[PDB]
């Protein structure tokens, strides 16, 4: 338990400098020592990896390492990711050493000769390193092939395959910070928002909310982050399709009456023009009629728990702007005619 800490942090230092381009000093001694230590991590992972206080203690050391580095200002090191990354740490290190261009010739020679002796040890007891890099190169190729001769950008994004994946990575990554309790998940989600491609990001979250439970503490964190920050949630409701947000609503009703609030705020920024039979926006960035018709049509094409809420939220909005029963006048008249 205490013996493992000095082993693992020394390996983590060596892993992080694997990426780094100082490689002149390195020799077969360094390489051999690296892969022996990596064997021991893989050994530990097999021996007392499962159902131990040791596992949870190493996870505290993981997340403590991963939060005191942070990934801000100095150096955004990925690092050895999590508990299953101990089961192929060797591979990570060896891959990083190949990617360092300044990796010395003699070291690389000793390296590749030690990774790939050849088929002299086709008989090996432990599912060995060679076999791990082969089955990788295979999966890799398999992915690439399947992407370009098989892969489809599904229109029910809740059933997409890349989305589904990126989503479940973010949920693992929230579960870890939840049990660590170091910084609040809000800070993590805010740093995301700041750093990365936003458009892509949001579809992730959307799918996140509908993924059934795996161990929905994650889902319950995302609703509270969003409702905390109204400004991003404005671009959420803006940036997706209707069906995605309709299902967001039927599942997490803590979102429904804020999003109805948004439409209630965008419709009231329209005017009829009599020449062209249409409501339109003043500004370029204001929802066109068809967009808003879509989104309301969706809320209506839904379970009864939401349908009565949105129907009444419109009828009360109509009475508020004069209960006319012809268009020209009340945007909300319009919608309600359009939905029959």
């Amino acid at each position: 338990m205490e013996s493992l800490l000095q082993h693992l942090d020394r390996f983590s230092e060596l892993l992080a400098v694997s990426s780094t381009t100082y490689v002149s000093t390195w020799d077969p001694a360094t390489v051999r020592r690296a892969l022996q230590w990596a064997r021991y991590l893989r050994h530990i992972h097999r021996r007392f990896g499962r159902h131990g206080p040791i596992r949870t203690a190493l996870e505290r050391r993981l997340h403590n390492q991963w939060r005191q580095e942070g990934g801000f200002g100095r150096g955004p090191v990925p690092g050895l990711a999590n508990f299953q990354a101990l089961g192929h740490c060797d591979v990570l290190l060896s891959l990083r050493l190949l990617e360092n261009r300044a990796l010395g010739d003699a070291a690389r020679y000793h390296l590749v000769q030690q990774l790939f002796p050849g088929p002299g040890v086709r008989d090996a007891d432990e599912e060995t390193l060679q076999e791990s890099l082969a089955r990788l190169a295979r999966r890799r190729s398999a992915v690439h092939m399947l992407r370009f001769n098989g892969y489809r950008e599904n229109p029910n994004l809740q059933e997409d395959s890349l989305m589904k994946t990126q989503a479940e990575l973010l949920l693992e990554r929230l579960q870890e910070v939840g049990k660590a309790e170091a910084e609040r998940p809000a800070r993590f989600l805010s740093s995301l928002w700041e750093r990365l491609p936003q458009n892509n990001f949001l579809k992730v979250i959307a799918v996140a909310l509908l993924q059934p439970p795996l161990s929905g503490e994650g889902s319950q964190v995302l609703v509270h982050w969003l409702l905390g920050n109204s400004e991003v949630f404005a671009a959420f409701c803006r940036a997706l399709p209707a069906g995605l947000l309709t299902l967001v609503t039927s599942r997490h009703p803590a979102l429904s009456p804020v999003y109805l609030g948004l439409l209630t705020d965008w419709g009231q920024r329209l005017h009829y023009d009599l020449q062209k039979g249409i409501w339109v926006g003043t500004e370029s960035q204001d929802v066109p009629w068809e967009e808003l018709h879509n989104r309301f049509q969706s809320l209506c094409q839904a379970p009864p728990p939401l349908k009565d809420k949105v129907l009444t939220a419109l009828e009360t909005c109509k009475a508020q702007d004069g209960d006319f029963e012809v268009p020209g006048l009340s945007i909300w008249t319009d919608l309600l005619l359009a939905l029959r």
Binding site: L274, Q275, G277, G322, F324, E325, V326, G328
Partner: protein
């Protein structure tokens, strides 16, 4: 309904009159389908003079319910519709002289002086004659 004093059902019927001017055309003799109004009910002059009028009749209800932005929009539309009725310019300039006179009002003054009956039917000229205010040129020399 305005003479019976009921803003709602007036602004109903003015709006429904403006829908059957604009999501329909009266000049569809692709099929001469029956006996039909040659003269009275097809003149472009009779169409632009039904439109200006309906927007006036509705823009004054908007002043009466106290929504003078809506009123301004229908009055501004009517000058775009028929620039030779002058009742439109009077109602628009009265609204502008209430709120924000100077540049807007003068911009329309110079237009009136730039500007300076063919066959409109009767029921309609008599209706225009009916609503028009006495104190109209009095306002336009101010």
């Amino acid at each position: 309904w305005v003479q019976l004093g009921a803003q709602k059902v007036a602004i109903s019927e003015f709006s429904r009159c403006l829908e059957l001017l604009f999501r329909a055309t009266p000049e569809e003799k692709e099929q001469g389908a029956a006996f039909n109004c040659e003269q009275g009910c097809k003149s472009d002059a009779a169409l632009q003079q039904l439109r200006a009028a309906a927007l006036i009749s509705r823009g004054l209800e908007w002043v009466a319910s106290g929504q003078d932005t809506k009123a301004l929009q229908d009055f501004l539309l009517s000058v775009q519709m028929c620039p030779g009725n002058r009742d439109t310019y009077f109602h628009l300039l009265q609204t502008l002289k209430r709120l924000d006179r100077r540049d807007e009002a003068t911009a329309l003054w110079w237009r009136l002086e730039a500007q300076t009956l063919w066959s409109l039917p009767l029921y309609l000229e008599s209706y225009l004659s009916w609503i028009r205010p006495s104190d109209r040129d009095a306002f336009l020399e101010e």
